[PDB]
Amino acid sequence: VGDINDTVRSYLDEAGAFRTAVVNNINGVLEGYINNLFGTIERLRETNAGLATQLQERDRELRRATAGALERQQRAADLAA
Amino acid sequence: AASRLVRLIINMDINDTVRSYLDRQAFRTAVVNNINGVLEGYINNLFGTIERLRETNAGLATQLQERDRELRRAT
Amino acid sequence: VGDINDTVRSYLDEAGAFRTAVVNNINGVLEGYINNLFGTIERLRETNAGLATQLQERDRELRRATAGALERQQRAADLAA
Amino acid sequence: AASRLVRLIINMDINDTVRSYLDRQAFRTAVVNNINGVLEGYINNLFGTIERLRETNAGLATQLQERDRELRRAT
Amino acid sequence: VGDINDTVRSYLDEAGAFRTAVVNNINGVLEGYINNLFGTIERLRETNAGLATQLQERDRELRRATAGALERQQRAADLAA
Amino acid sequence: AASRLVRLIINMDINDTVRSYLDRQAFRTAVVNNINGVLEGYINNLFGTIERLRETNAGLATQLQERDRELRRAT
Amino acid sequence: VGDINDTVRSYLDEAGAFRTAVVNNINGVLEGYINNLFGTIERLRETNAGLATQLQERDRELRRATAGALERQQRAADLAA
Amino acid sequence: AASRLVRLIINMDINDTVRSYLDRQAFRTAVVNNINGVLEGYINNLFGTIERLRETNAGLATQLQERDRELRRAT
Amino acid sequence: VGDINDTVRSYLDEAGAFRTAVVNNINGVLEGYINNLFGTIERLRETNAGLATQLQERDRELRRATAGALERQQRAADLAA
Amino acid sequence: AASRLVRLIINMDINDTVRSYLDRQAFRTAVVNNINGVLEGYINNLFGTIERLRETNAGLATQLQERDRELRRAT
DSSP states (O other): OHHHHHHHHHHHHHHOOHHHHHHHHHHHHHHHHHHHHHHHHHHHHHHHHHHHHHHHHHHHHHHHHHHHHHHHHHHHHHHHO | OHHHHHHHHHTOOHHHHHHHHHOOHHHHHHHHHHHHHHHHHHHHHHHHHHHHHHHHHHHHHHHHHHHHHHHHHHO | OTHHHHHHHHHHHHHOOHHHHHHHHHHHHHHHHHHHHHHHHHHHHHHHHHHHHHHHHHHHHHHHHHHHHHHHHHHHHHHHO | OHHHHHHHHHOOOHHHHHHHHHOOHHHHHHHHHHHHHHHHHHHHHHHHHHHHHHHHHHHHHHHHHHHHHHHHHHO | OHHHHHHHHHHHHHHOOHHHHHHHHHHHHHHHHHHHHHHHHHHHHHHHHHHHHHHHHHHHHHHHHHHHHHHHHHHHHHHHO | OHHHHHHHHHOOOHHHHHHHHHOOHHHHHHHHHHHHHHHHHHHHHHHHHHHHHHHHHHHHHHHHHHHHHHHHHHO | OHHHHHHHHHHHHHHOOHHHHHHHHHHHHHHHHHHHHHHHHHHHHHHHHHHHHHHHHHHHHHHHHHHHHHHHHHHHHHHHO | OHHHHHHHHHHOOHHHHHHHHHOOHHHHHHHHHHHHHHHHHHHHHHHHHHHHHHHHHHHHHHHHHHHHHHHHHHO | OHHHHHHHHHHHHHHOOHHHHHHHHHHHHHHHHHHHHHHHHHHHHHHHHHHHHHHHHHHHHHHHHHHHHHHHHHHHHHHHO | OHHHHHHHHHTOOHHHHHHHHHOOHHHHHHHHHHHHHHHHHHHHHHHHHHHHHHHHHHHHHHHHHHHHHHHHHHO
16 A cells, blocks of 8 residues: 555655654564464464364275275175175 | 565554654644645545445445346246 | 534634644544544445345346246247247 | 534544543633533533423323323223 | 532632633533433434334324224114114 | 532532542641541441441341241241 | 551551552542442342332232131131031 | 551452552662562462462362262272 | 563663662562462362362262162172072 | 563563563664564564464365365265
């Protein structure tokens, strides 16, 4: 959005020790951002753990299905022989 | 260091706090008046956008209701 | 209601650096109104998208009904002839 | 600044925030006393309006109850 | 409560630029009170409108009932003939 | 100035706002001590009313349960 | 808890103009206690009123039961004779 | 007014307010150091209490599960 | 997490009357933490009481069950004779 | 005061509050610039970390869909 840059250049023109206050505000913004991303990374870890458990569950289901199909085919072949 | 703030916001609450922070005395008052004027113009553009959106919404709603009424007639 | 206008003209008569503070406060107020305008635009965009979806669905079932009616009429005419 | 506020409020919370922020010594004290008197008069007018609302609501409720009894007699 | 008036009188006697602050703060109190007065006005207006709608619909059913009674008595009179 | 405040409190939150607003050094400390003492007297009276209400509630509840037991006996 | 008492004693040692601030703060907390006391008084009054009405209902029920029992016994005695 | 505060706290949120307001230069620094030390001591005592409570909770939980297993095998 | 220690060390170097304010803020934060400590000890006490009640109920149930089992064995012995 | 702070931190909003409060003029500006730089470096490190984590999550989800499709086709 160009409104952001327009406001930034308007502030720069108005300014032309405030730089110290700007730095402090930037540090506070960085702190807020780091808190938000801590939350996001924690929730994504939880989601990844859930997806991994789902993955192993469906892998077990696939193994069971393949084993059952192989057993049925083997017993059918034995009956045929 | 204003460029760092722009890159941080474009790399994405924070915007509103920055704006609230942003908000010779004769020159300062003149600059504040200029800022008020440009913000007022931007807000007028926003009003025009909202009016256009409302007009399109009304037109599409009348079209939808007319088509629904015609379909009910067709039954 | 003209009460707000009356109190504003009363405060202006009071006025005649305070005006700079008034301008700054109204600037903050219009910034909050800018936030409100952004929210309103988002809501209107969502409503417009939903309305477009509804109109396209209406055209779809209308076309279905017309096609069915034409098929019935054509088969009836062919049977009659 | 009066015209700008007038147009901003006619183009549509604005009143709430503006009048919230709204709130040589002899002159200012005297005119503030005058403003206080104006506010007292406005509040008295509003209380009179409240009393009128109370009276019309009471009359409307009584007539509705009487008509309820009228219908109950009619059956 | 007379205790409230006694405390107010004591504090005002102790106070007597203080009066200007007194008047400013009571103006703020007046604004806070007029907010709730506006809210109550709106609520009472809504209640009045609802009760008016109710009276109108009920007068309509009253007219229906009177018409039905007139029809019944006319039928009875015709049968008596 | 007291007339305006009593009119405002009797017009019907107002009490809370006025008390919040109410919230040479020796004279001021002495007079605020007197006001605090009046407040303590009021608070003690209201604590007495609380105690009396609690006692009456307990007695009435005991009577109620005794009468319920009496009715169950009377069956 | 004795911890609060010993910390108050330690700050009394600290003090030994703070008395005026202590007076103001106890005034404020006593205003808060007054609000809480008003709430408790209202709750107690409502509970007392409800219990009194329910007690009157109980009295009426017991009177009806005793009247019914007396009527039954008198009717039985009369029928016996 | 220490006696009044003691009476008020015994007669019973108030603690939070009084210790929120609670929190020459060299003497003040030394007494504040003493305050920090006594707060640290109380904190350590409370942490020991918390650890003991957690250990007892774990012991009761394992006793509950062991007794439930004994009941299940006793059937 | 080393950034917290790094910032604390940097601000200690910046300080080197700052120590008094730092200690005062530490005490304030300690009180704010004491609030949560009181909450947690209350919760732990409630959980401990609940677990004790469940333990006594369960061992009562177990002793009743073993008494019933002994009664059944005794009845079997009686019917055997 | 570093030892007290680290001991309080390791024993578990606490860090949030302590670093919110924690947040000649030439030396102060140099120190705050260094702090800003180290914050930016840490932010870059964690941003790389979250990018790798998002890539891993996306790959795991894609493989999840592929495995589900294979399982439903094998039937």
